[PDB]
Amino acid sequence: TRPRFLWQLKFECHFFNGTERVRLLERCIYNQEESVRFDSDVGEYRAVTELGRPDAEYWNSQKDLLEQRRAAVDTYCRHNYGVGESFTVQRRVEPKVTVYPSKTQPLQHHNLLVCSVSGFYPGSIEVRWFRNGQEEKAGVVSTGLIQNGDWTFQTLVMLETVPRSGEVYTCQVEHPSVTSPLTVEWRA
Amino acid sequence: EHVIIQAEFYLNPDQSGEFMFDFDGDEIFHVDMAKKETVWRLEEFGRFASFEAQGALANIAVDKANLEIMTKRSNYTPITNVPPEVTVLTNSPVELREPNVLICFIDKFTPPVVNVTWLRNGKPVTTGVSETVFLPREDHLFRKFHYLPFLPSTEDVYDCRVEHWGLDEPLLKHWEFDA
């Protein structure tokens, strides 16, 4: 089918340490190449590829527009930040932890264990394993932070072993939505 | 720690465009260009804040305008197709006779035009299927979503049908409960 032409525009607000540090980064992109951008840390527009040239020299000319794009750190970035602070930054939902085996087998013939945290937000999460109270940093192959798009995460941290009877495995999970790390144990 | 993104776009010849806000990768809200109304991701967000949809409508008018310019100055060089990556997934470890939801995560693709269709045993569906506008990524490609709810079984086999212009043939992704 026909050729496509695209124009993407992004206004970015990098918030470091809550609001104590902000950095606005206006970016102009054509197709998939950023042609011109503004940076609070530089104060003015600057080209990034020959096509950007006209633009940069341009805008920076209107010291009037520039003055605005520089204050935008307080009227836009900062202002917006506290608009949705409650349902975004503060957003917190306690995960759901569960344990089960992948391919039920005849005990002691090397297996794999998969903790399936699900329900998340925020993302920053931890989930260690503990065979009989002993932590293992050996055999915990993980899928990684999986974002679902409905504002909820779900990671799967697996562990490979060999089911000796009596052994009691456990998946621990610390989340900012819980004052005390959640836990779940499974008998071998 | 946190990043908000006022990302938007206009595409030709599709003459389609979009405007939405983003908080750390999660759409906060977007404007329904046609209905000219702001659409909050999670209905909750609206009982709290707001957004004059009328504003996005105007920003885009300019974007359209900027594309025309750039397209010309760039001497009509067009976008290079970039095939997405689909990865069917689920909301939570499927439990027989226990509700779930099949996700179809379209990712790393551009331009912003992709067809998706849900197949249950080969056949099409409309069982509470919704999607997400084109989400932004750091490399400027796009990341999309598609959800289909469903009550598990062994009496069923599902599939995510994804058509894009970088693909040489539709992209099929099968999902089926294993026992």
Binding site: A72, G82 | Q6, F51, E52, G55, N59, N66
Partner: peptide
């Protein structure tokens, strides 16, 4: 709490 958009500018003609 009103969300404020950032107006897009016209490129160099």
């Amino acid at each position: 709490p009103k969300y404020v958009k950032q107006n897009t500018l016209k490129l160099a003609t």
